[PDB]
């Protein structure tokens, strides 16, 4: 289930004041440098004129299973393709984005093995390898707004190479001269783009690099190309591997599953038991929201995994149950003060809480034992192993009516 997100200026008229870039990653589901780079771009950059359309992950089902491509190589499906291929509709969506008049340029991100060199050096460094290179299908595309691919590529490479972490990481140009007999690249995404008279580029980050360094180079390539296109932008951080690592591992990231409260992505216990999910609903249909763009759910054996790209954030052991939406709010005393707490919220507790009883609603405070409404509850009353978090501060309160699920509230002890 890929999606397209627009990064555009605040003033809608400014969209036509600079070029339009389509930024794509994750066509292989095991190349996280690309789709963590698109994720950070969406979360932390602003486009001040023009437009950058972003598909953060093209092959989302494969990403969720940490798999190169569950239905084969999606980047060989842009030429001949049987209408019955399982990804045929996804390919049509991708082609439609690429071919729209409102796109000038396309940048396709990949992670690749070893380090490309134009001459054979050794097993890791040679023309067959793909890491740390910037790729075009040909030097010029007649009829594009910016036909000079080579000039753009050379300048983008120069920009990246001004920021090398180690000298082995030096970027080189790879021109696949696709039209001149490269039957594999003839089936891939950027050649389709060139044939729609878009300027098209791919960036490769080496798989020999740690994720933060891969993402660093992908972001250098994006910035280099935006600079060549004269698409002005800002970002809310300094571009170095330390900062990239911090932003990937951002403790403010959350996931909201169905009508449940937001849970933090990071520092969840590895397994969460008896976790309510709506029954008779296929997992890909369960709404899941996040401030990140590469989060989802996927079935694995008898568990449901919460994924952040290729990272496993927790294993849900599901409790499939009817989600009754009639209960909107619950009266709770929080640190002596009565308040109406909405179902699906998180309430911070310094001292204590007390849930007011409701006639046909039963409350289970998970980790508290004696209906558990009508008890004054403090941190020392909790069995800490029932916490959602490694920090042992976040606990679930679940409401039932009374063979159906009426909702959840989280308490966080602060």
Ligand X SMILES: CC(=O)N[C@@H](C)C(=O)N[C@H](CCC(=O)N[C@@H](CCC[C@@H](N)C(=O)O)C(=O)O)C(=O)O
Q: Which residues are annotated as part of the binding site for Zn(2+)?
A: 28, 31, 44, 110, 139-140, 163, 236, 340
Residue numbers in the known binding site are 28, 31, 44, 110, 139-140, 163, 236, 340
Question: Which residue in the set 28, 90, 176, 203 belongs to the binding site for Zn ion (CB under 5 A)?
Answer: 28
Binding of residue 130 to ligand X (CB under 6 A): yes
Listed ranges 105-113, 163-171, 284-292, 308-316: which one lies at the site for ligand X (CB under 6 A): 105-113
Spatial separation of the C-alpha atoms in residues 80 and 403, rounded to whole Å? 52
Spatial separation of the C-alpha atoms in residues 399 and 265, rounded to whole Å? 23
Query: What is the smallest separation between the CB atom of 384 and ligand X, expressed in angstroms?
Result: 44
Binding of residue 186 to Zn ion (CB under 5 A): no
Binding of residue 190 to Zn ion (CB under 5 A): no
Q: Which does 108 bind (CB under 5 to 8 A by kind): Na ion, Zn ion, ligand X, none?
A: ligand X
Q: Which does 232 bind (CB under 5 to 8 A by kind): ligand X, Na ion, Zn ion, none?
A: none
Q: Which does 394 bind (CB under 5 to 8 A by kind): Na ion, ligand X, Zn ion, none?
A: none
Question: Which residue in the set 110, 198, 315, 393 belongs to the binding site for ligand X (CB under 6 A)?
Answer: 110
Report DSSP state, residue 356.
P
Q: Which does 284 bind (CB under 5 to 8 A by kind): ligand X, Na ion, Zn ion, none?
A: Na ion
Binding of residue 110 to Zn ion (CB under 5 A): yes
- CA distances 22 to 11, 106, 211, Å, are 20, 5, 23
Inter-residue contact 79 to 93 (CB < 8 Å): no
153-186 CB burial, b ≥16 within 10 A, e <16 = beebbebbbebeeeeebebeebebebeeeeeebb
Which residue in the block uniquely carries the two structure tokens 């997100």? 5
Query: What is the smallest separation between the CB atom of 20 and ligand X, expressed in angstroms?
Result: 19
Cβ atoms within 10 Å, residue 10: 8
- Burial classification of residue 302, based on how many CB atoms lie within 10 Å of its CB (0-12 exposed, 13-18 middle, 19 or more buried): exposed
**Closest alpha carbon to 137 in 149, 129, 122:** 149
Q: Which does 113 bind (CB under 5 to 8 A by kind): Zn ion, Na ion, ligand X, none?
A: ligand X
Q: How many positions of this chain bind Na ion (CB under 5 A)? A: 2
Residues at the contact surface with ligand X, assessed by CB under 6 A: 73, 75, 108, 110, 112-113, 130, 135, 185, 188-190, 202
């Amino acid at each position: 289930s890929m999606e397209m997100i627009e990064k555009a200026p605040t003033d809608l008229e400014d969209r036509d004041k600079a070029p339009h870039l389509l930024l794509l990653a994750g066509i292989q589901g095991d190349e996280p440098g690309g789709f963590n780079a698109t994720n950070l771009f969406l979360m932390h950059y602003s486009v001040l004129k023009g437009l950058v359309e972003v598909v953060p992950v093209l092959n989302k089902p494969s990403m969720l299973r940490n798999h190169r491509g569950l239905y084969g190589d999606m980047n060989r499906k842009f030429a001949a393709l049987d209408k019955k291929d399982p990804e045929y509709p996804t390919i049509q969506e991708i082609k439609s984005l690429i071919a729209k008049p409102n796109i000038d340029a396309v940048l396709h991100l990949h992670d690749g093995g070893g380090y490309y060199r134009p001459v054979y050096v050794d097993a890791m460094l040679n023309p067959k390898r793909w890491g740390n290179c910037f790729i075009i299908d040909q030097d010029e595309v007649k009829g594009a707004k910016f036909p000079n691919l080579l000039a753009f590529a050379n300048n983008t490479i120069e920009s990246i190479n001004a920021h090398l972490l180690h000298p082995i990481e030096e970027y080189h140009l790879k021109n696949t001269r696709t039209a001149q007999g490269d039957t594999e690249m003839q089936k891939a995404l950027t050649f389709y783009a060139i044939n729609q008279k878009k300027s098209a580029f791919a960036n490769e980050a080496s798989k020999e690099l740690p994720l933060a360094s891969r993402v660093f180079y992908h972001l250098q390539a994006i910035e280099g190309l935006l600079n060549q296109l004269n698409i002005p932008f800002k970002r809310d951080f300094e571009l170095n591997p330390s900062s990239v690592h911090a932003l990937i591992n951002d403790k403010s990231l959350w996931a909201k599953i169905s009508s449940l409260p937001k849970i933090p992505l990071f520092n969840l216990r590895p397994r969460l038991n008896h976790f309510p999910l709506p029954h008779n609903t296929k997992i890909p249909q369960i709404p899941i929201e996040s401030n990140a763009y590469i989060v989802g759910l996927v079935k694995n054996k008898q568990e449901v995994f919460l994924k952040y790209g290729n990272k496993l954030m927790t294993r849900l052991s599901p409790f499939y149950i009817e989600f009754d939406p009639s209960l909107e709010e619950v009266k709770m005393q929080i640190d002596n003060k009565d308040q109406m707490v909405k179902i699906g919220s998180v309430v911070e507790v310094k001292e204590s809480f007390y849930i007011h009883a409701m006639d046909n609603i039963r409350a289970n405070v998970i980790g508290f034992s004696v209906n558990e409404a009508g008890y004054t509850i403090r941190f020392k009353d909790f069995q800490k192993r029932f916490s959602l978090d490694k920090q042992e501060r976040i606990y679930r309160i679940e409401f039932y009516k009374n063979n159906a699920f009426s909702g959840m509230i989280l308490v966080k002890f602060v």
